[model samples]
Target: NSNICEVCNKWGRLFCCDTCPRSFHEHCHIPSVEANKNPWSCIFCRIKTIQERCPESQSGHQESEVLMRQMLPEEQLKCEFLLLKVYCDSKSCFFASEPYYNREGSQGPQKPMWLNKVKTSLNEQMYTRVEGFVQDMRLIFHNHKEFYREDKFTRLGIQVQDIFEKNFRNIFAIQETS
Candidate 1:
């Protein structure tokens, strides 16, 4: 087997460096070039040696932190409903395999009628999900009335409400499902 570090291809005797977990051939270590009684030092240990020689590398070591705020109850509910739609679309593999839609020439019902029902149901479910989001937005706005007083945020909220209502109208405007 070729003697090389698995990660950086440095020469070393050990299969992996203690510090970096990189594999290396024995000759890769600086001291390993010459036979010595001192214990073997991997690349990571060598970096530690350098850090000790230069103090700046060891200072200012702080772990990063992240803070995530919890979603509002209404947002959570809307998300759940959306997830339901997504799950139905993805998880109903069996539905696609079955002959749910009418075939050409031998069909009792036309293709449009069958497709229309599927489209109507999909639209209704989508509308329901959107309605849930709208209701949530209403609750959020009502609860934070002062926040809505701000012109920019209030305008954004109004836009969301308008868009959802428009979508609902367009979807529900479809012909009777029966």
Candidate 2:
């Protein structure tokens, strides 16, 4: 109920820090929901704790980063298929796809065949979420009705789509329901 957030200096519901004079909104606080952060420390104080015990704080940071090599298509245009096709067709998207074509002649530890320069550039979540994005934007099902888009540009697709959805319905609704 305090007037301002310790970190952002904005107004919000505040959670107090144990040893410090600051308070943060629950979003601003640096602990998991599963843990009771009663004696919680704000990030600044948490860094101090990190300094006292190195790697513990830094390790969490590393594990969280995980997005780093992380698409494509095929052809009868239908609902989502045409939508994805137009998305992939533009020249704006093809330039970033350079990594995929070039990887054909690479040696050890080079960019893996699965990673595309275009998709990875969007958000290096590398493999899981970004991977799913590449799949959704590019997959061609054996059944034509199921396909969202077809392949092209001799490459891949750009993923600036605000494309989160739970059900196939109203994909462009005002706010994402899920």
Candidate 3:
């Protein structure tokens, strides 16, 4: 009735998702999977729940800029959900932790970004506009590509960014306003 962590694919203390056979390590999952539930739903299952119960882009598709007029509560929730998706299948060390300390001298970028930081900003209500949040999300990948430069981290960053972009547009239902 149990399997290895779907993310790390290694045996450890794992949490079996209620909706699927897939299992995950506590640290490997998003939004603190440590909040144990009798029948816990993983990130993917919860995302599906949100989608079905609270559909996005209901007020018609709008450009990122247009949608920035006033950050709606739905939009904020979308941002939060998107962050969870980004962390979904990601390494806690690479995506969640501060990666710069591993290297010495000159650190990395002046303004480094990580998945947790994005989530913090969303929770703190720092992002007044949807584009602002989008930029921050993109910045994580941008810095990775520039800093890692053809490294495995860069490739991983690309893959993660692809997921973010796909979900961002679909969740927001963004359209070309031009």
Candidate number of the best lDDT: 3
The candidate 3 region of ten consecutive residues with least summed lDDT is 98-107
TM-scores of all predicted structures: 0.22, 0.28, 0.63
For 23-128, candidate 3 gives per-residue lDDT tens digits of 8787666444757478887766765666688565344465645546556775666676677666655443477766573443324776788877877787688988
Candidate order by TM-score, highest to lowest? 3, 2, 1
On a 0 to 100 scale, what is the lDDT of residue 150 in model 3?
49
Candidate 3: stretches off by over 4 Å: 1-62, 66-69, 91-93, 101-107, 175-178
Q: Which scores greater on lDDT, model 1 or model 2?
A: 1
- Residue 77 error for model 2, in Å? 46
**C-alpha local distance difference test of each model:** 0.35, 0.34, 0.70
Off by over 4 Å in 2: 1-3, 30-35, 54-178
**Candidate 2 residue-wise lDDT, 1-178, digit = tens:** 3467643467766776677777666643322112575666554454455346643322322211221212221001011221322333233233223322223333322322221332333333333332344344333211111222333322222232222121112221113233
Q: After superposition, how far is residue 136 of candidate 1 from its true place, in Å?
A: 2.4
